[PDB]
Amino acid sequence: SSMSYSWTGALITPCGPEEEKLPINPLSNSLLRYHNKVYCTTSKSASQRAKKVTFDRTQVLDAHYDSVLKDIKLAASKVSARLLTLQQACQLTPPHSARSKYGFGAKEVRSLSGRAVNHIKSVWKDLLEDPQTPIPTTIMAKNEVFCVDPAKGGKKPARLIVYPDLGVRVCEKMALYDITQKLPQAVMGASYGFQYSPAQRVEYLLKAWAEKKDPMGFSYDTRHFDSTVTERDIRTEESIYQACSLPEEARTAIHSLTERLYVGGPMFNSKGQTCGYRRCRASGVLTTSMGNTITCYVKALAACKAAGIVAPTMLVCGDDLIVISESQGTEEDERNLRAFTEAMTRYSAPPGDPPRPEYDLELITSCSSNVSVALGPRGRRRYYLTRDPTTPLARAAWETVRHSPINSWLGNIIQYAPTIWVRMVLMTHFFSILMVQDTLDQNLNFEMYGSVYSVNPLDLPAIIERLHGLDAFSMHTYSHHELTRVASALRKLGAPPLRVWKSRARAVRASLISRGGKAAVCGRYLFNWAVKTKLKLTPLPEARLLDLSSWFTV
Ligand SMILES: Cc1cc2nc3c(=O)[nH]c(=O)nc-3n(C[C@H](O)[C@H](O)[C@H](O)COP(=O)(O)OP(=O)(O)OC[C@H]3O[C@@H](n4cnc5c(N)ncnc54)[C@H](O)[C@@H]3O)c2cc1C
Ligand SMILES: Nc1ccn([C@@H]2O[C@H](COP(=O)(O)OP(=O)(O)O)[C@@H](O)[C@H]2O)c(=O)n1
Ligand SMILES: [Mn+2]
Ligand SMILES: [Mn+2]
């Protein structure tokens, strides 16, 4: 049928400056040594990515898909959603959002300047009066930091990002923002992954595991997901949004955004040259996350039907998928999972890596993370979320004239506080750097799902206890897998071994305790693991006052 992209030959040119590594990395050169292994994806590689994601797609639906789709439009029909005011949409523009071709940017939009409000008024009117003219988009390479992997060909080529002008992005929010806050939950309920904190996500997976008589799990991820989304998929989501109770002015605009933007259109490089035509999902529109998650859920749940997965329990995060179900014996389980992949490939969601039944919760990795188990001092099993620390460490060492890694450090401390690598490596280096800079009580930003939250470093014991409980300060005995991976990745980046971080942490704890006050609380709670004779940690009164509800939602 249809090709995901077609190209003119104009290069995918860069969007501003692409930072150079510096000869000295002063904030992270005591964290790790192999800075040569830490790289940023660039627009140089956008053409290799463009080759990999360009392919003819043939999608064959069936009675299982059709049945799932009907059940989901019915669930959608219980949702009522309102237009956003143009002013409400403007105020949701992030402060550094790409400026507009029409002489204004995020600053003027968020301030409700008249020049911008006027322009966006006319963009909106044109949305309701013209249902068909394609909206131009810009294509840029994403810049993101990785560690080199010689197993996987060296350096990953840059992901492709496609977005329309800033005026249209505000209009998307008027039409569709309220649906993004309501649809995924109403359609998948507890299966919606972007509603769980790390501890809540572990609770959920453990609950699912324990109620199967004979549990079996697998994960799934689609190869180059946005390029596999077909024009029929994108119109099938217009009809899932339209299933809601909506004012007519929204319906018109949703239809027009679908036909003129979401189903495809022309792409321009940053020099204004025509770059190609797109017939798949543009990653950069407001509906990227909601479309990906709903379209993944319909296909995945359809394929489960097609393969006879029994009593499935799903957890869907974009195109990342976990299914825990009743095992039919290992021989049938392997057959079913082959059937699942075949169905998914027929629905145009072919796999990155072929899935495989597992019977141990630690062996299932999805959303870049997995469940692991540690004892305490009691011998009592405590379960937590963790991940390969390689990409976290690489981003910990990204240091340019324009980018500080310090926010990146805080983000992993909050999100993976119970892990051994956060406790022994990141926390130790974090507080070591801030004490020497004398910046312990200076606010940092925590970035999650678009939003930024203000965090004072000295409040981490309360924050961590509110998120992960007091067991995050007491994990005694980590798993063989977890010890092996953390030791491997430190070796892989030239960081000191865990024995060295234990020495450094004894020092950080001592200095923290000597400063008294809030710092000493950090020394005692965050570093209790490092002293021979453990203090008895008591619940922190501050933690009950904390509302972290919106931190891990959307
Ligand atoms: C709705 C949503 C909006 C986000 N907006 C921003 C932003 O504005 N600025 C910023 O710096 N970071 C943004 N992020 C990245 C976010 O903070 C997390 O880093 C992200 O969820 C990656 O999870 P992971 O690295 O642990 O594992 P991953 O495997 O990398 O991510 C898990 C799944 O979440 C989806 N996803 C991952 N990263 C993104 C992303 N940037 N945008 C959209 N979907 C993604 C994918 O479908 C992926 O399969 C966003 C993430 C989501 C889910
Ligand atoms: N930085 C990112 C990463 C993922 N995504 C979205 O999430 C989808 C799946 O992400 P992914 O990690 O599986 O990478 P691919 O499947 O695209 O190779 C993308 O195809 C994009 O639609 C995004 O919009 N921005
Ligand atoms: Mn994928
Ligand atoms: Mn993925």
Q: Rounded to the nearest 5 degrees, what angle is found at the Cα of 520, between the Cα atoms of 518 and 524?
A: 120
Residue 116, phi then psi, degrees to nearest 5: -80, -50
Closest CA to 485 of 392, 405, 395, 398: 392
Q: CA distances (Å), 193 to each of 251, 261, 389, 400, 517, in order?
A: 27, 27, 21, 34, 38
Exposure of 154 by Cβ count < 10 A (0-12 exposed, 13-18 middle, 19+ buried)? exposed
Q: Which ligand is nearest to the CA of 144?
A: 2
CA distance 289 to 172: 13
Helix (H) or strand (E) holding 127: helix 114-129
Elucidation method: X-ray
Residue with CA closest to ligand 1 atom 16: 449
Q: Is 219 in the pocket of ligand 2 (CB under 6 A)?
A: no
* Ligand 1 probe mutation, 177, 449, 451, 553, most atoms within 8 A of CB: 449
- Within 10 Å of residue 51's Cβ, how many Cβ atoms? 12
DSSP count for the chain of H helices, then E strands: 22, 16
DSSP structural state of residue 23: S
Selection from 325, 345, 322 nearest residue 333 by Cα = 325
CB count in 10 Å sphere of residue 66: 10
Question: Would you say the C-alpha torsion 129, 260, 111, 86 has a positive or negative sign?
Answer: positive
Of the candidates 305, 316, 391, 319, the residue with the CA atom closest to the CA atom of residue 351: 319
Question: Which one of 163, 219, 233, 283 would you pick to mutate in the ligand 2 pocket, going by the greatest count of ligand atoms within 8 A of its CB?
Answer: 283
**Count of C-beta atoms within a 10 Å radius of residue 104:** 20
Protein residue closest via CA to atom 7 of ligand 1: 450
* Six token digits for residue 269: 């490089």
Question: Are the beta carbons of 365 and 219 closer than 8 angstroms?
Answer: yes
Single out the residue of 430, 216, 188 nearest to residue 294, CA to CA. 188
Look at residue 284 and give its three-state secondary structure.
coil
For residues 244 and 76, is the Cβ–Cβ distance under 8 A? yes
CA atoms within 13 A on the CB side of 214: 8
Pocket of ligand 1 (CB under 6 A): 194, 288-289, 292, 317-320, 367-369, 447-450, 554
60: left (phi over 0), alpha (psi -120 to 50) or beta: beta
Ligand 2 pocket check for 225: Cβ under 6 Å: yes
What is the 221 CA–ligand 3 centroid distance (Å)? 5
The answer to whether 350 and 228 have CB atoms below 8 angstroms apart is: yes
Rounded to whole angstroms, the Cα distance separating 194 from 271 reads 36
- Burial class for 295, CB neighbours closer than 10 Å (0-12, 13-18, 19+): buried
Which atom of ligand 1 is nearest to 318's Cα? Answer: 47
Instruction: Return the axis-axis angle of helices 460-468 and 518-526, rounded to nearest 10°.
Output: 40
Q: Ligand 3 centroid vs 227 CA: distance in angstroms? A: 10
- CA 517 – CA 530 distance, rounded (Å): 20
Burial 108-146 (b: 16+ CB within 10 A, else e): bbbeeeeebbebbeebbebbbeeeeeebbbbbbbbbebb
Any idea what the Cα angle at residue 449 is, between residues 447 and 452, rounded to 5°? 30
Count of Cβ atoms closer than 10 Å to residue 487 Cβ: 14
Number of residues assigned to the chain: 554
Q: Which atom of ligand 2 is nearest to the CA of 320?
A: 13
Alpha helices in 278-418 (DSSP H): 288-307, 330-346, 390-396, 406-415
* The pair of three-digit structure tokens given for residue 462, joined into one six-digit string: 């309360």
Q: Alpha helix locations (H) across 359-405?
A: 390-396
Amino acid at 354: P
Instruction: Give the resolution in Å.
Output: 2.7
- Which backbone phi and psi does 372 adopt, to 5 degrees? -140, 175
Ligand nearest to the CA of 281: 2
User: Distance (Å, rounded) from C-alpha 461 to C-alpha 514?
Assistant: 17
Exposure string over 277-293, b if 16+ CB within 10 A, otherwise e: bbbbbbbbbbbbbbbbb
**138 Cβ contact partners less than 8 Å away, ≥ 6 residues apart:** 15, 98, 162, 163, 164, 165, 267, 268, 269, 270
Ligand nearest to the backbone CA of 285: 2
Does residue 224 line the site of ligand 2, with CB under 6 A? yes
Rounded CA-CA distance 398/32 in Å is 11
